[PDB]
Design a protein around this ligand. Structure first.
Ligand SMILES: Nc1nc2c(ncn2[C@@H]2O[C@H](COP(=O)(O)OP(=O)(O)CP(=O)(O)O)[C@@H](O)[C@H]2O)c(=O)[nH]1
Ligand SMILES: O=C1N[C@H](c2c([C@H]3CCCN3)[nH]c3ccccc23)c2ccccc21
Ligand SMILES: [Mg+2]
Length: 163
């Protein structure tokens, strides 16, 4: 069984933990409990093959150089109602390029909080940014579970291609 080390990164509050907990536990955390560093594991079938997901949920607010070196793929999460978090994607992208010394690191752009009525980043904006970096884009809601499996499964597919 192939293991995949996945890292969830993004600004403080975009929903990194809520997305990961939805994937693992199938429920929505309404609380705001800032993360230091948590890991989760889940066995899944993706495209007919069992995969072990070893997922690191990171702080948005240390081990960063180390987890970027170890991580095989990155979910780069922003919130669709927070423009600052969208612009922060450039910073996370640049760091990952730096630590890994490559321009083709498996990544997926995730626009979370799609259920909220305060949208400030339209789908075209996000699709343009993802196209500019050569990565897929997935809209998610940790509240309704929209796109959660698809976001993580798409990242695994990007890792599979890279190997
Ligand atoms: N409506 C809605 N709320 C969400 C969604 N995702 C997260 N939230 C809410 O946003 C807040 C922050 O979510 P959380 O998962 O803690 O964000 P985080 O990026 O891990 C915060 P940190 O970087 O400090 O660990 C929580 O109150 C959570 O319920 C979503 O898809 N929809
Ligand atoms: O070299 C490191 N291995 C750690 C690790 C884990 C752990 C959790 C329980 C089993 N593997 N799963 C991961 C997923 C993505 C990236 C890093 C990890 C880690 C954590 C933090 C910093 C460096 C490192
Ligand atoms: Mg968190």
């Amino acid at each position: 069984m192939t293991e995949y080390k996945l890292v969830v990164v993004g600004a403080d509050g975009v929903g990194k933990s809520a997305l990961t907990i939805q994937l693992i536990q199938n429920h929505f955390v309404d609380e705001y409990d800032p993360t230091i560093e948590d890991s989760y594991r889940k066995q899944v079938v993706i495209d007919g093959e069992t995969c072990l997901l070893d997922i690191l949920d990171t702080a948005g607010q240390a081990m960063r150089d180390q987890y970027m070196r170890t991580g095989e793929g990155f979910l780069c999460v922003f919130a669709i109602n927070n423009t600052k978090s969208f612009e922060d994607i450039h910073h996370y992208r640049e760091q990952i390029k730096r630590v890994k010394d490559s321009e083709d690191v498996p990544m997926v752009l995730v626009g979370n909080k799609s259920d909220l009525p305060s949208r400030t980043v339209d789908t075209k904006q996000a699709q343009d940014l993802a196209r500019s970096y050569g990565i897929p884009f997935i809209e998610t809601s940790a509240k309704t579970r929209q796109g959660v499996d698809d976001a993580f499964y798409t990242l695994v597919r990007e890792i599979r291609k890279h190997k």
